[PDB]
Every structure is written in structure tokens, then in C-alpha cells.
Amino acid sequence: KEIDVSYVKIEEVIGAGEFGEVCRGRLKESCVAIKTLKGGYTERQRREFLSEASIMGQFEHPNIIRLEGVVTNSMPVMILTEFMENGALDSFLRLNDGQFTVIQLVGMLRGIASGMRYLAEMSYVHRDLAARNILVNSNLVCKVSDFPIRWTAPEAIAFRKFTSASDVWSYGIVMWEVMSFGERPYWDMSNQDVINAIEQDYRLPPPPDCPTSLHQLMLDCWQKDRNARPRFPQIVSALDKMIRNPASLKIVA
């Protein structure tokens, strides 16, 4: 949908993307995030930058970042998406350390898993699933955005075999990041140390106070055999069961 630039105001730079800046902005009133395309570029590069908006435009889900539209009849060329007040999930959790209950964290993981289940159903492989690419709004709603050795499945690092099963591996790492309040997967281990650890069949331990059943689900996500991993609908079902039976989440190691 073409948005007239007179309805758009640009504010503070909130991040960086492959084609330029990500900015906070206003649409008239609501807050939006704006991806700008400035400087030199060919038509093919402009179409490449704008392909993200048509991809997002195909998606309609409570846990997938919403598109507002594009600005193409003026410079800068822009993609407007809904603004997510709390930003990236990893930094939001690190700042708000211990501020959310086990049940609230499960709700966040359930949202993410539902968003991923939607993408997988649409035959869409994300390839870059990490807490840094999960955006949080004012109501703590977690949304998959952006349409990394530590988050990548072994077969995807080794053979570039990116599948929804390799996103499940990434999801398991997302789980660990959430339950640890935005701790870095594998701490300050180098990428080669991480690869070496996975080859030893080492797996990330339960974060402090993490329910055993949630850590078990992480291990399920981290099976070396991609075919042994649960699929996104199975992950959603496991979390829904934990939500129906919160007393089961009191079992910790």
C-alpha cells in the first residue's frame, strides 16, 4: 500500500539494516519503524529492498511484524512497519532481569513458536531466528521480524541445508536466551569453541530457575538429527500443555 510522505514523520535511528537505517517514526496517529533507502542504487536493488514489504505483506499473524506500507513516489524510499516499543527481546530481557515470571516467559516463547509455526506453514524458512530479531511491544507481545554460528543448526553451518527443522534448532537457542534473561548463547566461547562443543554432543544447560520440562524441550530442538527434532506445531502443543498445567513448571533441576 502506497503511503503519502506528508503522513510520515521520521525520528531517531533505532537500528541498522543491509540497505540503510531503521528509524522510529510517526504515521498520521501511531508510532512506526521506518527502513530508509538512501544514496545510490539500481532499480533491481530498489526492488530487492522493497521485496521485504511484499513478503511481510503476505503474512497476517499476531506474532509476525505488521506492515503499514511503503513510500516510493518520493525520496527517501521507505518501508513502514508497526513500532515495537520494547525493541529487541535479548536486550529487553537483560535490562528487565528477573522482572518476568516463568509463566510470562513461557507466554513469550509460545508467541514466538506460534509466529514460527505460521512461517513454517507458509513454507518460509527464517534462517536468522535469534532473540535479537524478536521484537517486543508495550503489552509484552513477541513478534518475528526481519524478512550467526551460535544460533545455527549443525547441518545448516556444514552444508547450507536451511529447513524449518534448522529454524527449530534456532528456536531452542531462543528458548535458552529467554529463560536466561538475554544471556549470550554459549557465553564468551568463540564460534570455533561452539562448533567444537556441538561436535562433543554438549548442549546448553538449564538456565537458573528454568523448569526441567522447558530445558527438555530445548534439548528436543537441539537433536543432531534434524528429523528427530519436534516440528513447530509440536513445540506449540508442548508449551500449551505447560500453560494448562502451571504446577508442572515448578519442577526445576
Exposed/middle/buried for 145, CB within 10 Å: 0-12, 13-18, 19+?
Answer: buried
Question: What's the CATH number where 14 sits?
Answer: 3.30.200.20
Side-chain-side CA neighbours of 56 within 13 Å: the count stands at 23
Q: Annotation-wise, does 18 bind a ligand? A: yes
Question: What's the CATH number where 157 sits?
Answer: 1.10.510.10
On whether both 240 and 144 belong to a single domain, the answer is: yes
- Closest by CA to 206, choosing from 169, 239, 176, is 176
- Closest by CA to 62, choosing from 107, 17, 128, is 107
- Closest by CA to 83, choosing from 131, 132, 31, 134, is 31
- The alpha carbons of the chain give a radius of gyration, in whole angstroms, of 19
On whether both 79 and 91 belong to a single domain, the answer is: no
SS (H, E, C) 68-102: EEEECCCCCEEEEEECCCCEEHHHHHHHCCCCCCH
Determination technique for this PDB entry?
A: X-ray
Q: Annotation-wise, does 15 bind a ligand? A: yes
Structure resolution, Å = 2.1
On whether both 72 and 116 belong to a single domain, the answer is: no
On whether both 44 and 154 belong to a single domain, the answer is: no
On whether both 24 and 141 belong to a single domain, the answer is: no
Residue ending a domain, choose from 67, 83, 99: 83
Residue 114 is which amino acid? S
- Closest by CA to 101, choosing from 250, 205, 221, 251, is 250
Cα distance between residue 92 and residue 114, in whole Å? 20
Cβ neighbours of residue 209 under 8 Å, at least 6 residues apart?
102, 252
Angle at 145 between CA 207 and CA 131, to 5 degrees: 15
Cα distance between residue 170 and residue 44, in whole Å? 31
Q: Annotation-wise, does 32 bind a ligand? A: no
On whether both 111 and 235 belong to a single domain, the answer is: yes
Residue ending a domain, choose from 51, 83, 115: 83
Q: Annotation-wise, does 53 bind a ligand? A: no
**Grid coordinates given for 247:** 504446577
Catalytic annotation, pick one of 128, 193, 209, 220: 128
DSSP the chain: -B--GGGEEEEEEEEE-SSSEEEEEEE--EEEEEEEE-S---HHHHHHHHHHHHHHHT---TTB--EEEEE-SSSSEEEEEE--TTEEHHHHHHHTTT-S-HHHHHHHHHHHHHHHHHHHHTT---S--SGGGEEE-TT--EEE----GGGS-HHHHHH----HHHHHHHHHHHHHHHHTTSPPTTTT--HHHHHHHHHTT--PPPPTT-BHHHHHHHHHHT-SSGGGSPPHHHHHHHHHHHHH-GGGGG-B-
Contact by Cβ (8 Å): 7, 28: yes
Known catalytic membership, residue 97: no
On whether both 78 and 95 belong to a single domain, the answer is: no
On whether both 35 and 68 belong to a single domain, the answer is: yes
How many domains, in total, are found in the chain?
2
What is each CA distance from 137 to 24, 91, 130, 141, 230, in whole angstroms? 14, 13, 17, 5, 28
Pairing of strands 8-16, 21-27: antiparallel
Tally of CB atoms within 10 A around 234? 15
Q: Annotation-wise, does 182 bind a ligand? A: no
Q: Annotation-wise, does 88 bind a ligand? A: no
Q: Annotation-wise, does 25 bind a ligand? A: no
Angle at 3 between CA 112 and CA 128, to 5 degrees: 25
Residue ending a domain, choose from 29, 64, 83: 83
The backbone region for 39, taken as left when phi is positive above 0, alpha when psi lies in -120 to 50, beta otherwise, is: left
On whether both 235 and 142 belong to a single domain, the answer is: yes
The backbone region for 187, taken as left when phi is positive above 0, alpha when psi lies in -120 to 50, beta otherwise, is: left
Q: Annotation-wise, does 16 bind a ligand? A: yes
Domain region containing 68: 1-83
Breaks (C-N over 2.5 A) in the chain follow: 28, 147
Cα distance between residue 206 and residue 218, in whole Å? 9
